[PDB]
Design a protein around this ligand. Sequence first.
Ligand SMILES: NC(=O)c1ccc[n+]([C@@H]2O[C@H](COP(=O)([O-])OP(=O)(O)OC[C@H]3O[C@@H](n4cnc5c(N)ncnc54)[C@@H](O)[C@@H]3O)[C@@H](O)[C@H]2O)c1
Ligand SMILES: NC(=O)c1ccc[n+]([C@@H]2O[C@H](COP(=O)([O-])OP(=O)(O)OC[C@H]3O[C@@H](n4cnc5c(N)ncnc54)[C@H](O)[C@@H]3O)[C@@H](O)[C@H]2O)c1
Ligand SMILES: O=P(O)(O)OC[C@H]1C[C@@H](O)[C@H](O)[C@@H](O)[C@@H]1O
Ligand SMILES: C=C1C[C@@H](O)[C@H](O)[C@@H](O)[C@@H]1O
Ligand SMILES: O=S([O-])[O-]
Ligand SMILES: O=S([O-])[O-]
Ligand SMILES: [Co+2]
Ligand SMILES: [Co+2]
Lengths: 367, 360
Amino acid sequence: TTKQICFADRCFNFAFGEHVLESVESYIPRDEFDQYIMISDSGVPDSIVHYAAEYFGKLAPVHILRFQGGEEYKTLSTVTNLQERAIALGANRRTAIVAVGGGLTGNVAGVAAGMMFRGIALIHVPTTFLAASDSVLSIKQAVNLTSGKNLVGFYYPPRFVFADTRILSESPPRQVKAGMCELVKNMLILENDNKEFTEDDLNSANVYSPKQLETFINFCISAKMSVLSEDIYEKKKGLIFEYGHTIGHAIELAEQGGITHGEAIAVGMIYAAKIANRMNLMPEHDVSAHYWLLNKIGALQDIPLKSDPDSIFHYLIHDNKRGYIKLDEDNLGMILLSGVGKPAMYNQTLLTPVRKTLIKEVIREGL
Amino acid sequence: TTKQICFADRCFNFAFGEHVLESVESYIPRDEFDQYIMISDSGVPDSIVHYAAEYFGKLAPVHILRFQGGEEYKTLSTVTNLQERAIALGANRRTAIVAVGGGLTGNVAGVAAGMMFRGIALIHVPTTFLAASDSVLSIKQAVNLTSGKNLVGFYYPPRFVFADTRILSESPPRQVKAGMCELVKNMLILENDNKEFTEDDLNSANVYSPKQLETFINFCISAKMSVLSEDIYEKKKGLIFEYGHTIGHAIELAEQGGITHGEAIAVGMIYAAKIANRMNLMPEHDVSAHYWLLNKIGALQDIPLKSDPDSIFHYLIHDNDEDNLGMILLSGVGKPAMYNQTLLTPVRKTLIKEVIREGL
Ligand SMILES: NC(=O)c1ccc[n+]([C@@H]2O[C@H](COP(=O)([O-])OP(=O)(O)OC[C@H]3O[C@@H](n4cnc5c(N)ncnc54)[C@@H](O)[C@@H]3O)[C@@H](O)[C@H]2O)c1
Ligand SMILES: NC(=O)c1ccc[n+]([C@@H]2O[C@H](COP(=O)([O-])OP(=O)(O)OC[C@H]3O[C@@H](n4cnc5c(N)ncnc54)[C@H](O)[C@@H]3O)[C@@H](O)[C@H]2O)c1
Ligand SMILES: O=P(O)(O)OC[C@H]1C[C@@H](O)[C@H](O)[C@@H](O)[C@@H]1O
Ligand SMILES: C=C1C[C@@H](O)[C@H](O)[C@@H](O)[C@@H]1O
Ligand SMILES: O=S([O-])[O-]
Ligand SMILES: O=S([O-])[O-]
Ligand SMILES: [Co+2]
Ligand SMILES: [Co+2]
């Protein structure tokens, strides 16, 4: 399957299916690019990297560039070293950067590619379900400073995306689960019949076929791009993709790598639902709909939540990776819903002011 | 004097005149920014930096960040250090970065600003005539890699530009000359029968009044923006502003700091003219016209072609088919030579080499 993705007038083909890469030659013009610089963080399996390199190798010479994985090395310094090594390989304006990995590699490679010669071709090969169904459906690129996550970056589209659903289907279930959390976020925030699966197709093991993941990817493409095609910077209606993220991101920091992003977000959406209900915005049945879908993917079942309430609050009021978290002394802005499919508006924005009372309460009581 | 500059849909006011910073409260609202991080490389006279801090302070807290100047330190690593320090000072989405310096400070602060929170306000206070009349009239931002110049960057527009013509009138004459070379380049590449100055107004000592510099800046705004307003990435008709730069960049490298960028460009334009002549595009008179105008500004005076042709040609072939290199050429003054729907004309490497050998 091939979908045409467009962020305003910046379009790319997102091909996804089994052995898409062995069909790369059908998607990229024979002499589009004179060289492939393949970029992959050190945690990506070598078998995926070497496999991708052999197929890109049918079009033009490929070089493989690894770098040290982990959020500690997701920095402009890692980017510079990759750009230097690329130039030392003879990279030029006709080179494409092929990012082979999850979202960490996507971001690092996207910052590299968006700056080299003021911007060269970026091709995504997402190897995690979260990268394939969420993070490559965003043109934000960012890396970390010592004082914060994703503090430096910009907006930069790819030229191509290839998601191999056989690779995704063999990925770790805890990682599939993480991207399934964001998929269930998409189900709760936006009205849909434009999905070719039901809640019956969700399972709590997070083990899916290549074809089921293909169908999930298609739904995420439709869902996200229905909003981001027009809101490319994710500053308006695109705030909706931050449902569950306000508290979720703080919990994610507090747990210091103990929980996945998707798990933190799943918990963050449960909190948002309870808050919207405690504010009279959302009926109880809609809150129960959050628990019902999240349990279907086994989201809340695991979840080694080890941090204290005060540490979660600390991370929340000291956070800068989104603008306008703390409105005034008493209130944080949150993306809340009046119901499944129904974002709550406040003053022509998706940020509803929420009293710190309710936030501390839901955090302390947990699940 | 204020001109609205528009890169497509991204506009800013460019204010320029004497003691222009004294009137800052007339351009930027009070509410607008919570804070000003004023960045300047170590080579910028401290008096200018403190002077600018003083007037921005009338609006909001200003913190000054200095960084080691020079092309060797114009890197992403300097940018990161500047960003981290700005974060340590409480920089946020409502902070403006104020770049006080020449094109080097502009580019370093430009990249810094373009990346923080994925883009905060950039404010230029250009203190060299080159920056005021050329580099601030481009949304190109870039820094260096080990392997070469300006290899990493992006396009990012500023929110305001303030050029104090008094400061510029007192900058070193060799620095003024460098920006006058790009002005001459504008004269040579665009047709304009309605300039507010003539060739008689150009001098070789490169000493001008504040008002004369304001007139040159205005000329440069009209000239570049007549093309760049539409061609924002400088990839189409905006390639014209690279006239003299193909051999220029390489001369500038070969000389190792010994000549300015305008001087290198000046020489690169003469070689481009000779080239277009040997290729039957340019009459001999237009070639002399290049020499004539550049000698008006003393462009060829402090020039040491301390270099052999071979050093120049090597940097040229290492600069990012096999017998040709593309050049912007002209058929005559004000007359860009088109080739196959583009401003890039293939030129034989062996021809380039022989013109360089022959010299001025
Ligand atoms: N990347 C681009 O598209 C682009 C375009 C134009 C310029 N630039 C960069 O700018 C540099 C050249 O620009 P420039 O001529 O403005 O010089 P510059 O910024 O390199 O300045 C040269 C020297 O002037 C000092 N200086 C600044 N203001 C002064 C003043 N008022 N009086 C005395 N000294 C002063 C220093 O900062 C410095 O030691 C190059 O590195 C060039 O790449 C880049
Ligand atoms: N661009 C955006 O809008 C955007 C969106 C969401 C997330 N992100 C970024 O993505 C990162 C998280 O992304 P992620 O969840 O994809 O994980 P990740 O990139 O952090 O990868 C997680 C781990 O899985 C490895 N890995 C990758 N593919 C694998 C596979 N098939 N099998 C086994 N291991 C594999 C990695 O090397 C790694 O150690 C963060 O840096 C985040 O901010 C960016
Ligand atoms: O950083 P680059 O791509 O080398 O571009 C710089 C040029 C950009 C252009 O707008 C200006 O007219 C030129 O003098 C200037 O040298
Ligand atoms: C920050 C983002 C960008 C947005 O596009 C995604 O849905 C989110 O899940 C992701 O965390
Ligand atoms: O976490 S959210 O729903 O603002
Ligand atoms: O130097 S230019 O004329 O390509
Ligand atoms: Co998320
Ligand atoms: Co120039």
